[PDB]
Every structure is written in structure tokens, then in C-alpha cells.
Amino acid sequence: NKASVVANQLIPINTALTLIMMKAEVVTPMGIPAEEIPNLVGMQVNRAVPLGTTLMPDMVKNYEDGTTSPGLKSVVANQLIPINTALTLVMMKAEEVSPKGIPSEEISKLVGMQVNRAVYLDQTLMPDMVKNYE
């Protein structure tokens, strides 16, 4: 019904979108609308986006706070962290997002733990990536 956020140009992998790249056109499929334009802008995609691609929640990891109640809030790396780096709650954001990798129940004991793999922008933390997880 309303205008959806569809990228006008083609975007590469892991790239923050801009105002010129984000176009509010009324087209399908209806992915994410332009309500959280300031929150969705500069989001990093998981793969290459073609031209005229609508905002899809399955292609973007943590695009914005679309979920209302937390409950199943999993830890997510809001910023990019290099391999083997003691990251703490500052860069870790445990919010309700999919998929549900590792919850924030033992984060207090792993605060400032060194990861064994490379971490990208807003990505969900998983037990398969961390080899020193409890």
C-alpha cells in the first residue's frame, strides 16, 4: 500500500546504503517500508544486491529494531570485529533478531572474550564461530 524502501542502484556485499541508493517506491514485494529510513540507512547487506531490490529482512541481518518484545534476544556484533579480538558488551548488542545463535545468558562470563573467527558488522553470534564458547 505505502512506498517500500527499494535500492535504485546495485549494491555490493557488506555496504552501508545511502539516501541516493535508498528509493521509497511503491513496488513489490513489500519488504521494509521507509518508516525507519534513518535506522535502515547505512545497513550492511550479506550479499550483492541487484538494481531495484526491495529491503528484504532475510538478506539483511540486524537492519533495525523491528521486533517489539525481546525474550529471544541473541548477542549480535553491531560493529566489525577482526579475528582474535577481546570484544565486550560495548560492541556486542543482544537484541531479538534471527537467527538465534548464542543468547546473552553467559555473556557476563564471556565479556571481553577473544573470537577465533573474523566478525563482520551487525551479525548474530553463533556457537559454531566461537570455539571457546561454554
UniProtKB/Swiss-Prot annotation:
Keywords: Antifreeze protein, Repeat, Secreted. InterPro entries: AFP_Neu5c_C (IPR006190), AFP_Neu5c_C_sf (IPR036732), Antifreeze_III (IPR006013), SAF (IPR013974). Its main location: secreted. Residues 4-63, 74-133 form the AFP-like domain. One of its GO terms (cellular component) is extracellular region. It is found in: Secreted. Residues 65-70 are annotated as: Linker. CDD domains: Antifreeze_III. The record marks 9, 14, 18, 44, 79, 84, 88, 114 as: Important for ice-binding. Detected in blood serum (at protein level). Contributes to protect fish blood from freezing at subzero sea water temperatures. Lowers the blood freezing point. Binds to nascent ice crystals and prevents further growth. Belongs to the type-III AFP family. This is Ice-structuring protein RD3. It comes from Lycodichthys dearborni (Antarctic eelpout). The lineage of its organism: Eukaryota, Metazoa, Chordata, Craniata, Vertebrata.
